[PDB]
Amino acid sequence: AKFVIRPATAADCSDILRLIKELAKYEQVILTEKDLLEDGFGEHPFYHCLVAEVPKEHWTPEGHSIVGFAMYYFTYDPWIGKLLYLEDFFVMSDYRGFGIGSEILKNLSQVAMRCRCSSMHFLVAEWNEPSINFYKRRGASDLSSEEGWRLFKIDKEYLLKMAT
Amino acid sequence: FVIRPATAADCSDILRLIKELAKYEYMEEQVILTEKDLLEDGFFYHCLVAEVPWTPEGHSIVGFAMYYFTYDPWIGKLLYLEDFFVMSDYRGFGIGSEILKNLSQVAMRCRCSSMHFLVAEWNEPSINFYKRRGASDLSSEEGWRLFKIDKEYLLKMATE
Numbered sequence: 001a002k003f004v005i006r007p008a009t010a011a012d013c014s015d016i017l018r019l020i021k022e023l024a025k026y027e028q029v030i031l032t033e034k035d036l037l038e039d040g041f042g043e044h045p046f047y048h049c050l051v052a053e054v055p056k057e058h059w060t061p062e063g064h065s066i067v068g069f070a071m072y073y074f075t076y077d078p079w080i081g082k083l084l085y086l087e088d089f090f091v092m093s094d095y096r097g098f099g100i101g102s103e104i105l106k107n108l109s110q111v112a113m114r115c116r117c118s119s120m121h122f123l124v125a126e127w128n129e130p131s132i133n134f135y136k137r138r139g140a141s142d143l144s145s146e147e148g149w150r151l152f153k154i155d156k157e158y159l160l161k162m163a164t
Numbered sequence: 165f166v167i168r169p170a171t172a173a174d175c176s177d178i179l180r181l182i183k184e185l186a187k188y189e190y191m192e193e194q195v196i197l198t199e200k201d202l203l204e205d206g207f208f209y210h211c212l213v214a215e216v217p218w219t220p221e222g223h224s225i226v227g228f229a230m231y232y233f234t235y236d237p238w239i240g241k242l243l244y245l246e247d248f249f250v251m252s253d254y255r256g257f258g259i260g261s262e263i264l265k266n267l268s269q270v271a272m273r274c275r276c277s278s279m280h281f282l283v284a285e286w287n288e289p290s291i292n293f294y295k296r297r298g299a300s301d302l303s304s305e306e307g308w309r310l311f312k313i314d315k316e317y318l319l320k321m322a323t324e
Contacts, residue, residue: 020237020238023237024238027238028238029237029238030238030239031237031238031239031240035240039235039240039241046233046234046235046241047235071235071237073233073234073235074208075208075232075234075244075246076205076208076209076230076232076246077246078182078185078186078195078197078230078246078247079186079191079194079195079196079197080194080196080197081196081197081201081205081208082205082208084318085234087234087235087236087237088237105321106321106322106324109318109319109321109322110322112315112318112322113315113318113319113322117315117318118314118315119312119313119314119315119318120312120313120318121310121311121312122310122311122312123308123309123310123311124308124309124311125306125307125308125309126303126307126308126309127307132309132311135311135313138313138317138320138321139313139314139316139317139320140311140312140313140317141311141312142309142310142311143309143310143311143312144303144308144309144310144311145309148284148285148286149282149283149284149285149310150282150283150284150285150301150302150303150304151280151281151282151301151302151303151308151310152280152281152282152283152294152299152300152301152302152303153278153279153280153281153299153300153302154278154279154294154297154298154299154300155277155278155298155300156271156277156278157298158268158297158298158299159268159271159272159276159278159279160268160272161268161298162264162265162268162297163265163268163269163271163272
């Protein structure tokens with residue numbers, strides 16, 4: 001259960017897609033490996049990922065070495081500027097309890113310090129009390145509820161109508 | 165008017181508008197950013213400005229939108245609209261609508277499958293403006309709540 005945390009490289013795309021699908025089980029993953037490569041390793045990456053890698057004696061049954069990841073990117077708020085935005089954070093069930101999640105959060109926090117980011121933002125489902133409390137124990141606050149902010153989206157078919 | 169990408173020169177007008185919007189959101193005291201930050205961080209975000217052929221004191225910029233790109237593991241590249249504001253005397257169809265059309269064009273070029281943004285609970289004018297264009301409330305539909313861990317707490321985790 002030796003593991004190392006490191007940035008993902010282009011060579012890790014199939015593993016990232018595999019983990020995203022694992023994460024979906026806790027939902028229609030349409031992203032492809034091709035998407036992960038072009039969106040993550042071009043001149044202007046749309047996301048960054050830290051992955052957890054284990055040696056062979058602990059590879060998964062399918063024979064894989066990447067057992068966890070955190071996908072994040074930098075955002076901005078006009079009030080304070082730069083923020084680190086944590087999009088997803090997942091460690092395979094059989095690899096939890098060994099310190100992988102804690103080291104990932106530590107490294108994400110160090111990256112935030114390097115960035116001079118003022119805060120780390122992320123979404124939590126309102127009903128997921130266990131997760132809410134996990135983050136509250138780390139100093140989190142529910143900005144949506146405290147300040148009265150709701151998240152909205154406008155999907156592709158509408159953007160197309162407006163664009164044409 | 166015309167909707168166009170901002171230039172370094174527009175940093176002064178963008179800050180002025182950010183502060184007007186902040187007052188509308190009951191957050192003007194929280195704007196700690198400067199024209200200097202806007203310049204260094206933007207030339208982490210992109211801005212569109214609405215320029216007219218001028219306000220009574222001589223400003224040509226009367227609206228703006230600030231956006232950046234984000235990522236969703238299920239579907240890819242997304243466009244995120246951070247702030248959107250049109251000066252009072254310049255509202256009355258066209259600008260806000262054209263800003264959204266320009267943002268939609270940006271999304272089409274990125275092959276962004278959705279545009280996300282936040283809206284205040286009581287902001288019926290914006291809620292309706294977006295809903296008239298097809299927007300859906302994800303906080304309602306998917307139950308999402310935005311959480312934050314500020315720097316003092318990130319420092320605790322970084323240093324153990």
